[PDB]
Design a protein around this ligand. Structure first.
Ligand code: MG
Ligand code: MG
Lengths: 233, 155, 75, 101, 45, 199, 526
RNA sequence: UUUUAUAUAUAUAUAAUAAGGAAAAGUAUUUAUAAGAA
RNA sequence: AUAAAUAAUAAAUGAAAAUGAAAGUAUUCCACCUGAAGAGUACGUUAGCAAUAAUGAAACUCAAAACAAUAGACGGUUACAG
C-alpha cells in the first residue's frame, strides 16, 4: 500500500470544513488532536549497529589500515570486488539478533534430552521484578532449569572465575547435577514417608497410563476385528 | 563532470524520495559534492556526510587514489508534513543537448520567459548553473554576471 | 568546494605500493611452482608401477591374467 | 475539498499532471488575466474561486477525466509557498522569486 | 622482498610515533616532513 | 537494553529446535520441549507464545517449532506425553557416574531421565521392598517384548510362557501382567534398555 | 579548555593561536566538543554564517564529529539571535529525525526562539500569535517529561516564559513573574548570606535585580493595548497556567522586603501603566532603596553644587591641557554614575524600552519628562566643559555645576536614542520635536563619539535617520520635502522601495504621476 | 571519547577517569501567456 | 551470507489487460509508425538457375477503422446438483 495521507491529516480537513463554514461545531477530538500532533513521517531508517552482539554495520577497512600481510601472506593493495559494492540494504535490513546463550542452550538440551520433558512456562510473570545474584544457581521466584546453568556459566565467565566457556559450563553442570539429585531424593523420601505414615493414594502414574492404554486398546480391538471381517470378504 | 552521472544521481534521489529512505549514497566527486552542497544550502537535504561504500565514515578519512574508488557522499533526505521535501530532480542541459546561457537569457528565464524551450523558473524551484567549474544557483550566477551552463531543476 | 578532492600519492608511497604488489605476484607464483613440484614428487613416487618397457608389460600382464590374482568382479 | 490558491486568485505554479490519459498543463497568470482553459476547467475554476489561469489539455479530452484530473491536480500537484519554506527551513523571503528588469 | 617491506614500514611507524625523533632523523640526513621521512627511510634501505 | 532482556526472555530460553513434530521413526528420548500454561491463561488462550492458540485445544501442554509462519499458523502439537514417561520411570524406582567429577554433543549419562543413585532400597509398611513390581503389557508373540509404564523392554521369562499367551495370540496386549524390573541400562544413542521378568 | 576561556573573553587572536598551535605542533584537530566551542565563539561574536558553516562541517567530517544535542541547542540559540523560526523548527525536526534525544535546554531554546520571532509582524511573517502559542506548547511538552535538567535551565525557563509574556503584552503575567523571581531570589540570597543582612543590603539587592527581567517587564509595559487578549488565555492548559501564576502572585502580595507594585491584580488604564513603569524604574535605579539617588532635596542640591564646585575648580589647574582636564571629567562622571546608580540596570537597552513605553502609550508629556531627566546630549555637555574651563582657568556657573552633578542620572544620547525620539516625533506629529532632534543630530555628528564609529556604520545610521525624516514628512503631508530629501542624497544613500513605500502610496493616492516617476527612477535606476 | 593504572609478550587484555551553558529592546514594477467542439 | 533464474506482489506506470526489476524512475544510440482499403499491390531498379527476395508508390472510395474492458445473447461449451 501507498503511504496514506488522509488518515493523519484529519485535523487539516476538519479545520478547512470549519473555517469554510461547511461544519458549524468543532468535533470534540479537534482540540485534543491539535494538542497532540500525529506523527506524519513514515521513513525507512538506517541501522548501523546490531544491538544483540554490538557488531558495527556500515564500516569498511581501508587499504591503509593494513600495513601488514594477511593470513595468506598477501598485502592488501587495492580494494576487492566485494569492497566496491554499495551496502545500503545492509543498513536498511532489520538486524538479526544473536546471543551466546543460544549456542549453550542448544548444547544443554542435546546433552540432557530428558530435561526437555520437564514442562516450561513461557508466560513471563514480571521481567523487571527479577532480582538475582548468580553466585548460586537457585533463585527464589525461578525454577531450576538448564537456563539457570547457562546463566551461571555467563556469570562465571563475566567475573573471570574461569577462563574458557567449557570450564564454566562444566562447573555449572555439576552444580546442576548436585541440586537435581537433592530434589530427586526429596521426592523419593517424601513418597516413602507418606506411605510410612498411612497415606493412601487412589491412582499412580503407571496405573493411569495403563488405564488410558486400556481404553485405546479396547477401541483398537473393536476396529481391528471389524476391519478383519471387512477385509476377509 | 559527467552529466550522465548527475542524471543518475537525480534519478537516484527521486527513487529514494518515492520509497522514503532517510539516508542514501551518491558518487564522491567534485561535481556531485558541489551539487549536494547546493541542495543542502537550500534545505533540500538534511545532512552531508563522507563515507565508504558500506556507510558513513566513523572517523575522518583522508581521500587518496588508494580509496577514491570506495568513497561515497551520504545525503540525508527530508520528509515534512507527510511529503518529501525533495520531490522531483531533473536535468535541463542533457548530454545530447547541452544548454549554455548568457546572463541576460538567464535573467529572462528567471523572469517567466521561456528560453530555448526551458520552462521558466517556478516560485519554489531551484535551478543550478555551472560556471568555471563551480556550481551555484541561477540567482547567484546572475548576480555574479557569469554566463554558464544550465544544468538541473530541483522543485 | 574550491580545494583538491584528493591528496596525490607521493612517489615514495607509490614505490612502496609497487613493491608490495610485486611481492604479492612473486609469492603467488612461488606457491604455484612449489605445488607443481609437490605433484611431480608424488608422481615420481608412483612412477614405478607405470609401464614404459616391454619387460614390465609382460610381467604385469602375466600377473593380472596368468596369475589368479584378485579380480574386480562385482558381486 | 479545499484547494491551495495563490493570492486567492490563481495556482501557485505551473502544474504538469497526468490522469488516465489526460495531460493537464496549467500555468498561473497575472492579475486581470482571465480563465483561458478547457470549458470543463473553466467551470471548475469558477466554482473553486480561481480567477486567473492558462492551460492546455493533451491526449484524452474526456470531460469527466478532465474534471477529476483538474481536482486531483489542484490537490496533489500543488504546494503553498509557506509549505515549501517550512519544509526547507527557510523564510518566505528566501523562496520568493527575485524581480529582474 | 618481504623483509625489506616490513622493515621499511616498521621504521616509518617508529619514527612517526616520536615526532622529535623524526626531526632528528631529517636533520642528520641533512606533511612535507612525512614525505621527506619516507624518502630518507627508503633510501636508507 | 531491549536486546539483553530479549536474550533473557523465556521465549529465548527455549532452545532452537526444528525437528519434525510428527515423527514416525524410533523414539528414544524427548525431542521437543514441553510448554505448559496455567488454567487461567488457558482460559484466555495465552501460552506465552507470539499468538493465541486456538480455543479448540483443551490440553495444557504442547510442543512447538515456529512462533509464526508464512501460513499465519503456529506450528505446534497438543502433546505433553513424554514427561509422564519420565515421571513413570520415577515410580518404577529402578536406578540407572558422569554426574560426578571442544563442546561434545553426546548424551551425558542419563540425560535427565533419572538422577537417582543405585545404592538405596524402598521401605514399605509390609517391610523392605526386595524387588520392585510394576504392571505392563506383553506386546507380541515372538525375546518377548513388553510395554511397561511408557518404555518398551525385553522380558526375561521363567520356564515356559503362560498358556494364556498361546491361547490369545495377537490379542495378547489386551491383558495386563505384572513384571519385576531386573535391570535398567542406558545405551549410547539414548535408548533405555530394561530387562524385566514376568512373574 | 583553552577555547572555552578564549570564548569567555572573546579573544579572536587567542582562539586562532591555540588552534594553529595544536594543529602544527601536536597533530590535534578539533573534535566534536572543540568544534562546538568554536560554534559558541562564532555565536558570541555575532558570526552566524561561520557558525553555520562549522555546523555543516561537524555533520560532514565523520559520525564522531556529528553534532549532538548540545550543538543543536547552540544552533537554536543562533536562530534565536537571528529570529529565524523556520530554521529552529527544521532543526527540531532534524533532531527528531536523527534519533538525537532532546533535553530541557532544547525546549526552552525553541520557546525563546519563537518568542523572539513573534516580536513584530515583519520578522514573524504575520504569524506572531501562532508563534507565541507554539512556544507555550514547547514549554508544555517540556512539562510533560523530565528530560535532562541543568542548574541554569530553571533560570532560563522563567526568562522564556517572561519573553512569551513580554511579547504578548501580558502585563498581568509579566508583573506576576517579575515579582515571583525577585521575591524568590531575595529570599534565597538572604537565607544563604554569611554577612549580616542589614550591612550587605546593597550587594544582595544588586545581585537580585537582573537587568534582563526588568527589560522584559518594561517591554511588556510598552506593548500595552487595552483591547489585546492574551494568547495564553485560549488554551485550557494556558488559562490554568495563568490562574496558577496570578494566584501565587496575589497570595504572595497579600502575605521583610516590599516592591512598589500597585495593590491591583491587573492594570486597565494607561495612567496606571505609566505609574508602575516609573515606580519599578525608580525602584531598580535605587538598588531596592539602598541607594537614595532618585530622592532629592534642595539642601542636597546646594551641598552637591558646593562640593562639585570645589572639586572642579581645584581640578582646573592640574591638567596639562584642556584635553587632559576633559579626560579627568570623563573619568569623574563615569565613576560617579556607577557609584550612584547600578551600571547593569541603567544602560542603553533598558532606557530604550523605558522611553518606548510612553510612545506606544501615546503620552508625550511623560516621554519628554523621561527623556530630559534620564538623557544628556553630548554636544551640550562638551560645551559646558568648555564654559567651565573658561570660567575657572581665567547664576549660569551654578547651573553648569548642577549639570555636571546631574550627569549621574543621565545617559549619552546615541544614534539609536535620537532615532527613537524621531519615532516619537512621527507618532505625535510634533514638528518642533523633529526640528529639535534634527538640530541635535547635526550637532552630535560633530562630537567625538559619532566620529569614533566606522564610516559604514555612520552611513547606515545617517540613512536610517534620513528614512525616518522622509516618513515624518510623508505623514505630515509634505511630500515635496520627502522627495527633496530623497533626491538630495541619492548617491550617498541607497534608497529602496521598502523605505519609500509609504511615499509612493501617498503620491499615488493624489495621482502625482511626475513625482511618482521621479521617485521610482531614483529607487529603481540600479 | 581521551588519558592513565595493573598484568602479559613497541604491542595486547582488563579497571578508572568526560573538558563542549550562550541569556537583552529597537534597528509595488513579479513580468510571457498556448481553451476546444461533433 | 553473496549472486542469478522463477513465481506472486508494494510503489510507479498504463486506455486497460497487465508490467514489475521492466511496460518503473533517468541517460545514450539505433530501427520503425502517422486513418481503413487500394497494398506489400503495380511500375521501375538490384540479386538469384528459377520459385522469387529487397526497395516500393500513386490515383480512386469512405467516415470510417482498431485496441482493452463491461453487460448480455449464443456455442455441434465444461462441471456440479436437483
Ligand atoms: Mg503502451
Ligand atoms: Mg515481391
Amino acid at each position: 500500500m501507498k503511504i496514506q495521507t488522509n488518515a493523519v491529516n484529519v485535523l487539516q480537513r476538519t479545520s478547512a470544513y470549519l473555517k469554510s463554514g461547511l461544519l458549524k461545531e468543532t468535533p470534540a477530538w479537534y482540540n485534543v488532536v491539535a494538542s497532540i500532533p500525529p506523527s506524519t513521517k513514515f521513513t525507512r531508517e538506517p541501522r548501523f549497529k546490531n544491538p544483540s552482539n554490538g557488531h558495527i554495520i556500515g564500516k569498511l577497512v581501508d587499504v591503509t589500515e593494513q600495513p601488514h600481510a594477511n593470513n595468506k601472506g598477501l598485502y592488501k593493495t587495492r580494494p576487492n570486488s566485494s569492497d566496491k559494492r554499495v551496502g545500503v540494504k545492509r543498513l536498511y535490513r532489520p538486524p538479526k539478533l544473536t546471543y551466546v546463550e543460544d549456542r549453550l542452550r542448544s548444547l544443554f538440551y542435546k546433552q540432557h534430552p530428558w530435561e526437555l520433558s520437564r514442562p516450561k512456562i513461557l508466560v513471563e510473570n514480571e521481567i523487571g521484578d527479577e532480582n538475582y545474584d548468580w553466585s548460586h544457581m537457585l533463585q527464589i521466584g525461578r525454577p531450576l532449569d538448564g537456563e539457570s546453568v547457562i546463566q551461571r556459566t555467563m556469570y562465571l565467565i563475566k567475573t573471570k572465575q574461569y577462563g574458557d566457556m567449557v570450564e564454566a559450563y562444566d562447573h555449572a553442570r555439576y552444580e546442576f547435577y548436585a541440586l537435581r539429585m537433592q530434589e530427586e531424593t526429596e521426592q523419593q523420601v517424601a513418597l516413602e514417608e507418606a506411605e510410612m505414615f498411612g497415606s493412601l493414594f487412589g491412582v499412580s502414574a503407571i496405573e493411569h497410563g495403563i488405564q488410558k492404554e486400556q481404553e485405546v486398546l479396547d477401541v483398537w480391538e473393536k476396529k481391528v476385528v471389524e476391519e478383519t471381517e471387512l477385509m476377509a470378504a | 563532470m559527467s552529466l550522465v552521472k548527475l542524471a543518475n544521481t537525480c534519478a537516484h534521489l527521486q527513487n529514494c524520495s518515492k520509497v522514503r529512505v532517510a539516508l542514501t549514497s551518491i558518487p564522491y566527486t567534485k561535481l556531485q559534492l558541489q551539487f549536494a552542497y547546493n541542495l543542502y544550502q537550500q534545505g533540500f537535504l538534511s545532512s552531508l556526510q563522507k563515507g565508504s561504500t558500506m556507510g558513513p565514515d566513523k572517523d575522518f578519512v583522508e581521500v587518496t587514489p588508494d580509496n577514491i574508488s570506495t568513497r561515497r557522499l551520504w545525503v540525508g533526505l527530508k520528509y515534512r508534513d507527510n511529503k518529501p521535501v525533495l520531490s522531483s530532480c531533473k536535468l535541463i542541459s542533457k548530454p545530447n543537448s547541452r544548454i549554455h546561457l548568457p546572463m541576460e537569457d538567464m535573467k529572462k528565464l528567471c523572469s517567466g520567459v521561456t528560453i530555448r524551450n526551458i520552462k521558466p523558473l517556478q516560485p519554489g524551484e531551484l535551478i543550478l548553473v555551472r560556471a568555471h567549474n563551480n556550481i551555484m544557483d541561477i540567482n547567484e550566477a546572475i548576480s555574479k554576471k557569469l554566463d554558464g551552463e544550465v544544468l538541473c531543476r530541483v522543485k | 568546494m574550491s580545494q583538491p578532492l584528493l591528496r596525490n600519492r607521493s612517489p615514495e608511497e607509490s614505490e612502496l605500493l609497487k613493491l608490495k604488489r610485486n611481492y604479492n605476484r612473486s609469492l603467488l607464483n612461488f606457491q604455484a611452482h612449489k605445488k607443481k613440484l609437490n605433484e611431480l614428487l608424488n608422481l615420481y613416487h608412483v612412477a614405478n608401477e607405470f609401464i614404459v618397457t616391454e619387460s614390465q608389460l609382460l610381467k604385469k600382464i602375466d600377473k593380472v591374467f596368468n596369475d589368479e590374482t584378485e579380480e574386480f568382479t562385482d558381486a | 475539498k479545499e484547494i491551495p490558491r495563490y493570492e486567492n486568485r490563481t495556482i501557485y505554479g505551473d502544474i504538469d499532471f497526468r490522469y488516465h490519459g489526460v495531460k493537464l498543463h496549467l500555468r498561473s497568470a497575472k492579475p486581470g488575466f482571465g480563465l483561458r482553459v478547457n470549458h470543463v476547467i473553466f467551470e471548475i475554476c469558477e466554482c473553486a474561486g480561481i480567477k486567473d489561469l492558462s492551460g492546455k489539455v493533451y491526449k484524452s479530452r474526456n470531460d469527466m477525466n478532465i474534471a477529476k484530473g483538474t481536482i486531483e491536480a489542484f490537490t496533489k500537484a500543488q504546494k503553498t509557498l509557506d509549505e515549501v519554506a517550512l519544509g526547507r527551513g527557510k523564510k518566505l523571503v528566501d523562496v520568493r522569486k527575485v524581480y529582474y528588469s | 622482498q618481504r623483509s625489506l617491506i616490513d622493515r621499511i614500514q616498521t621504521r616509518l611507524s617508529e619514527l612517526l610515533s616520536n615526532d622529535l625523533k623524526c626531526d632528528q632523523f631529517l636533520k642528520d640526513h641533512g606533511n612535507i616532513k612525512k614525505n621527506l621521512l619516507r624518502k630518507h627511510v627508503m633510501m636508507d634501505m | 537494553t531491549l536486546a539483553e532482556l530479549l536474550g533473557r526472555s523465556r521465549i529465548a530460553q527455549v532452545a532452537n529446535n526444528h525437528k519434525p513434530l510428527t515423527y514416525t521413526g524410533k523414539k528414544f528420548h524427548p525431542t521437543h520441549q514441553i510448554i505448559e500454561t496455567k488454567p487461567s491463561t488457558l482460559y484466555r488462550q495465552e501460552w506465552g507464545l507470539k499468538s493465541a492458540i486456538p480455543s479448540k485445544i483443551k490440553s495444557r501442554y504442547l510442543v512447538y517449532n515456529d512462533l509464526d509462519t508464512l501460513e499465519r499458523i503456529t506450528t505446534f502439537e497438543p502433546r505433553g506425553g513424554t514427561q509422564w514417561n519420565r515421571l513413570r520411570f520415577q515410580e518404577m524406582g529402578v536406578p540407572i557416574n558422569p554426574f560426578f567429577k571442544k563442546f561434545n554433543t553426546e548424551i551425558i549419562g542419563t540425560g535427565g531421565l533419572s538422577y537417582s543413585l543405585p545404592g538405596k532400597l524402598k521401605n514399605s509398611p509390609n517391610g523392605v521392598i526386595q524387588r520392585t513390581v510394576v504392571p505392563g503389557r506383553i506386546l507380541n508373540v515372538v525375546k518377548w517384548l513388553a510395554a511397561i509404564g511408557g518404555f518398551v523392554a525385553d522380558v526375561v521369562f521363567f520356564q515356559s510362557p503362560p498358556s494364556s499367551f498361546n491361547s490369545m495370540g495377537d490379542f495378547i496386549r489386551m491383558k495386563t501382567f505384572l513384571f519385576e524390573i531386573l535391570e535398567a541400562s542406558m545405551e549410547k544413542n539414548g535408548s533405555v534398555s530394561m530387562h524385566a521378568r514376568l512373574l | 579548555n583553552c577555547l572555552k576561556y578564549s570564548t569567555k573573553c572573546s579573544s579572536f587572536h587567542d582562539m586562532d593561536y591555540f588552534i594553529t598551535k595544536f594543529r602544527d605542533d601536536y597533530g590535534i584537530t578539533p573534535n566534536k566538543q572543540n568544534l562546538t566551542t568554536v560554534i559558541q565563539f562564532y555565536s558570541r561574536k555575532e558570526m552566524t554564517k561561520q557558525a553555520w558553516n562549522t555546523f555543516d562541517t561537524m555533520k560532514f567530517l565523520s559520525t564522531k564529529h556529528f553534532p549532538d544535542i548540545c550543538t543543536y541547542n547552540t544552533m537554536l540559540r543562533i536562530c534565536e539571535k537571528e529570529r529565524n523560526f523556520p530554521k529552529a523548527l527544521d532543526l527540531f525536526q532534524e533532531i527528531q529525525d536523527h534519533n538525537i534525544k532532546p533535553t530541557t535546554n532544547t525546549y526552552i531554546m525553541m520557546a525563546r526562539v519563537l518568542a523572539s520571532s513573534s516580536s513584530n509582524a515583519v520578522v514573524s511573517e504575520g504569524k506572531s500569535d501562532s508563534l507565541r502559542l507554539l512556544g507555550w506548547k514547547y514549554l508544555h511538552e517540556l512539562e510533560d517529561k523530565n528530560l535532562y535538567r541543568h542548574k541554569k535551565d530553571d533560570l532560563n525557563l522563567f526568562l522564556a516564559m517572561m519573553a512569551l509574556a513580554a511579547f504578548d503584552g501580558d502585563i498581568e503575567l509579566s508583573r506576576a513573574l517579575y515579582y515571583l523571581f525577585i521575591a524568590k531570589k531575595y529570599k534565597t540570597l538572604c537565607a544563604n548570606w554569611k554577612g549580616n543582612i542589614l550591612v550587605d543590603q546593597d550587594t544582595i539587592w544588586k545581585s537580585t535585580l537582573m537587568p534582563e527581567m526588568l527589560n522584559y517587564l518594561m517591554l511588556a509595559y510598552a506593548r500595552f493595548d487595552p483591547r489585546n487578549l492574551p494568547v495564553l488565555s485560549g488554551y485550557e492548559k494556558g488559562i490554568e497556567l495563568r490562574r496558577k501564576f496570578l494566584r501565587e502572585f496575589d497570595s504572595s502580595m497579600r502575605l521583610k522586603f516590599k516592591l512598589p507594585f500597585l495593590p491591583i491584580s491587573d492594570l486597565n488604564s494607561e495612567a496606571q501603566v505609566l505609574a508602575e513603569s516609573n515606580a519599578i524604574w525608580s525602584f531598580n535605579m535605587e538598588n531596592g532603596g539602598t541607594r537614595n539617588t532618585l530622592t532629592s532635596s534642595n539642601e542636597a542640591a546646594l551641598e552637591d553644587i558646593k562640593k562639585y564646585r570645589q572639586l572642579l575648580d581645584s581640578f582646573a589647574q592640574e591638567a596639562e591641557d584642556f584635553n587632559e582636564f576633559k579626560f579627568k571629567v570623563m573619568y569623574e562622571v563615569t565613576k560617579m554614575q556607577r557609584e550612584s546608580i547600578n551600571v547593569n540596570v541603567f544602560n542603553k537597552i533598558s532606557l530604550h524600552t523605558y522611553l518606548s513605553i510612553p510612545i506606544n502609550l501615546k503620552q508625550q508629556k511623560e516621554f519628554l519628562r523621561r527623556l530630559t531627566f534620564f538623557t544628556f546630549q553630548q554636544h551640550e555637555f562638551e560645551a559646558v566643559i568648555k564654559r567651565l574651563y573658561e570660567g575657572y582657568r581665567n547664576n549660569l556657573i551654578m547651573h553648569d555645576i548642577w549639570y555636571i552633578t546631574c550627569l549621574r542620572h543621565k545617559i549619552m544620547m546615541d544614534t539609536t536614542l535620537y532615532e527613537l525620539v524621531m519615532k516619537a516625533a512621527i507618532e505625535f506629529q510634533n514638528e518642533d520635536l523633529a526640528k529639535k532632534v534634527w538640530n541635535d543630530r547635526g550637532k552630535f555628528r560633530t562630537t567625538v563619539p559619532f566620529l569614533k564609529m566606522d564610516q559604514r556604520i555612520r552611513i547606515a545610521k545617517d540613512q536610517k535617520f534620513a528614512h525616518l525624516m522622509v516618513e515624518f514628512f510623508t505623514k505630515q503631508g509634505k511630500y515635496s520635502d520627502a522627495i527633496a530629501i530623497i533626491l538630495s542624497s541619492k548617491n550617498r544613500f541607497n534608497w529602496t522601495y521598502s523605505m519609500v513605500r509609504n511615499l509612493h502610496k501617498a503620491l499615488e493616492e493624489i495621482e502625482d504621476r511626475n513625482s511618482v516617476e521621479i521617485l521610482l527612477d531614483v529607487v529603481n535606476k540600479k
